Design a protein around this ligand. Sequence first.
Ligand SMILES: Nc1nc2c(ncn2[C@@H]2O[C@H](COP(=O)(O)OP(=O)(O)OP(=O)(O)O)[C@@H](O)[C@H]2O)c(=O)[nH]1
Ligand SMILES: [Mg+2]
Lengths: 167, 42
Amino acid sequence: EYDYLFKVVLIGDSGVGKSNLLSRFTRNEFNLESKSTIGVEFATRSIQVDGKTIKAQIWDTAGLERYRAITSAYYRGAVGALLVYDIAKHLTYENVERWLKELRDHADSNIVIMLVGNKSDLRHLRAVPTDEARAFAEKNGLSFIETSALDSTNVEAAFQTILTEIY
Amino acid sequence: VSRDELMEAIQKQEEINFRLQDYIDRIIVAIMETNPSILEVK
Ligand SMILES: Nc1nc2c(ncn2[C@@H]2O[C@H](COP(=O)(O)OP(=O)(O)OP(=O)(O)O)[C@@H](O)[C@H]2O)c(=O)[nH]1
Ligand SMILES: [Mg+2]
C-alpha cells in the first residue's frame, strides 16, 4: 500500500482550526459549525513524495490548556507536528510557547515542527503580524506558514511541506 | 427553580464535564496503548 508511514500530530488552542485542517487535508472537507473535539482521533491520507507513497497519519484532539494523561501517548512515535494558532486571536499565539514547551518535554528530539497561522481568510481582523510569527519560528527552528482551512489556502501546501521535510 | 439553584446547576454541570473529560483521557490512554485503530475517523 504505502512506502512510508508518518505520524503527524496537531496541537494548539481550542478553536484555532486543528480539526478542519485535518478534514481539509484528509477528506477535502470544511465545517463552519464543527464542535470541540472529544477524545483523540486520527485520519490518514496517502500522498506522493519523491516518487514514494507516503501514508500520513494525522492525529487530533481538543486543545485543552492543561497537561493530559494522553500527552505521552499522543506524541509517541510522531515525526511531525503542526503547532496551530489563530491569526485573528493574539491569545492563541501567546500560548504557542506553552504548546512548544509541552512538545519539547514529550516528543522525540528530532520531530519536525511547523508553526501554522490559521484563519488567514480573516486577515481584515489580523491580530498576529506575519513577520513576528516567522521570526519566532526561525528562532526556534520551526517551519512557518499561514493557512485558511475555510478557503483552503496553503492547507495542502502545509502538509506537503512538512512531510517533505520529514522525508 | 430559583436563581441560586440555576447558577448552582451550571456549576454542577461544569464540574461533571471536567470529571468526564478526565475520565475519557484516562480510558483513552489504555486504548492508545492497546488498540488505537478504534480511534480512526474517515
Ligand atoms: N474563518 C475561519 N474559521 C475557521 C478556519 N478553520 C477553522 N475555522 C472555524 O473555527 C472554529 C473552530 O474550528 P475547529 O477546527 O473545530 O478548531 P479546533 O482547533 O479543532 O478546536 P478544538 O477541537 O476545540 O481544540 C469552527 O467554527 C471552524 O469552522 C479558518 O481557516 N477560517
Ligand atoms: Mg477539534
